[PDB]
Amino acid sequence: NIQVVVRCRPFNLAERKASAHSIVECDPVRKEVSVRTGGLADKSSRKTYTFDMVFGASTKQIDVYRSVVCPILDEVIMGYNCTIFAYGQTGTGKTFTMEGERSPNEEYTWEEDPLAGIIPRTLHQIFEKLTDNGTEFSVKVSLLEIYNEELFDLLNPSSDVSERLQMFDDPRNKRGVIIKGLEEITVHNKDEVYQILEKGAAKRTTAATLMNAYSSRSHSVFSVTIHMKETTIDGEELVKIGKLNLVDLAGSENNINQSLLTLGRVITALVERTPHVPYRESKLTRILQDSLGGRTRTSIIATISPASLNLEETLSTLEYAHRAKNILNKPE
Numbered sequence: 001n002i003q004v005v006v007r008c009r010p011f012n013l014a015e016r017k018a019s020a021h022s023i024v025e026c027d028p029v030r031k032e033v034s035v036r037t038g039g040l041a042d043k044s045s046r047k048t049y050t051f052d053m054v055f056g057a058s059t060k061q062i063d064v065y066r067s068v069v070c071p072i073l074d075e076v077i078m079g080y081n082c083t084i085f086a087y088g089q090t091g092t093g094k095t096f097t098m099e100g101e102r103s104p105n106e107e108y109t110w111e112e113d114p115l116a117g118i119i120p121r122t123l124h125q126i127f128e129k130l131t132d133n134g135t136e137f138s139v140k141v142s143l144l145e146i147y148n149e150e151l152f153d154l155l156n157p158s159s160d161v162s163e164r165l166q167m168f169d170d171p172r173n174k175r176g177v178i179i180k181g182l183e184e185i186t187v188h189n190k191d192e193v194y195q196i197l198e199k200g201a202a203k204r205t206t207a208a209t210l211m212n213a214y215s216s217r218s219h220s221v222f223s224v225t226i227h228m229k230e231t232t233i234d235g236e237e238l239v240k241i242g243k244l245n246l247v248d249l250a251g252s253e254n255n256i257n258q259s260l261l262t263l264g265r266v267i268t269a270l271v272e273r274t275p276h277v278p279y280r281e282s283k284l285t286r287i288l289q290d291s292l293g294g295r296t297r298t299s300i301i302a303t304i305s306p307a308s309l310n311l312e313e314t315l316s317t318l319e320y321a322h323r324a325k326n327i328l329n330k331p332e
């Protein structure tokens with residue numbers, strides 16, 4: 001089964017002043033998420049769900065990485081393909097979890113910033129883990145985004161944010177596709193990571209100015225490919241290639257996101273073991289087909305809010321994530 005975890009965001013200053021009380025309770029020991037759906041103080045009703053891991057509002061970035069990503073990166077380094085999806089309503093922490101932010105007032109360098117998310121921590125760790133273990137390696141990254149079923153390359157420095165990419169089936173891969181023009185940037189060392197990320201961020205700002213609700217309606221796929229070569233004591237070369245897809249999905253809240261709709265239908269088809277799985281019905285599911293009931297080790301981080309105002313969407317997200325737990329994958 002694929003791994004499904006839940007992360008609740010902490011209250012913001014506005015909610016803090018309103019003396020808001022959380023309707024979400026996370027028990028890491030029991031690995032459960034309990035939501036107050038009604039009831040008055042001394043008695044109420046609740047909805048509880050169990051997941052592989054649960055992270056409360058106070059969970060720090062480093063702990064999400066240690067608990068969820070560390071094991072996944074080790075697998076990527078073993079030469080397997082892995083994917084991590086961030087799913088949930090806009091404003092619940094998908095981007096904070098997948099990307100992170102900078103601590104205010106330049107208190108920390110990017111490498112030591114406690115607010116850094118999965119992407120920067122992962123890139124930094126790859127270089128650390130392969131510092132001198134005898135494995136020669138190269139790291140390449142790409143950032144593909146889907147908006148209104150159109151494809152954009154956020155790491156191409158010479159292309160206009162208006163330029164769309166074309167997708168084709170891979171002749172030498174039945175369930176694979178080729179994204180013509182998608183640029184792969186080589187990360188030569190840890191000291192090249194931040195600037196590369198900043199460039200993509202700058203280009204996304206241009207995208208936001210041009211496309212409506214870009215940050216919430218778009219799907220982003222940040223891919224890291226590690227080509228590795230080991231040489232045995234007898235001179236033989238051992239090759240392994242690991243790939244990690246870090247996906248920040250469009251907000252799940254209740255116009256017409258074909259890829260988001262298709263992702264849900266694919267999950268339903270997989271869990272209900274229906275013969276036909278509609279992978280080809282959206283660009284997102286075609287690109288990530290192997291991550292959904294395929295040979296890629298997949299994990300989903302469902303993000304929720306502690307505010308009573310978001311009760312309906314929170315329950316929807318939990319029900320969606322809990323169902324996804326039934327998806328079966330077959331690693332390499």
Ligand SMILES: Nc1ncnc2c1ncn2[C@@H]1O[C@H](COP(=O)(O)OP(=O)(O)O)[C@@H](O)[C@H]1O
Nearest residue numbers: 009010088089090091092093094095096097303
């Ligand atoms: N774990 C967290 N700790 C501190 N702040 C968080 C956390 N998660 C989310 N936030 C804050 O909550 C807001 C949620 O925004 P964001 O990450 O962009 O959500 P989304 O991508 O799901 O729309 C941001 O301002 C972010 O800084």
Ligand SMILES: CCOC(=O)C1=C(C)NC(=S)N[C@H]1c1cccc(O)c1
Nearest residue numbers: 099101102110113116119120197201
């Ligand atoms: C200009 C600020 O940029 C950022 O915060 C980030 C960018 C560009 N890209 C990603 S994936 N994550 C953010 C990030 C990167 C490194 C350390 C951090 O603490 C936060």
Ligand SMILES: [Mg+2]
Nearest residue numbers: 094095096215
């Ligand atoms: Mg976001």
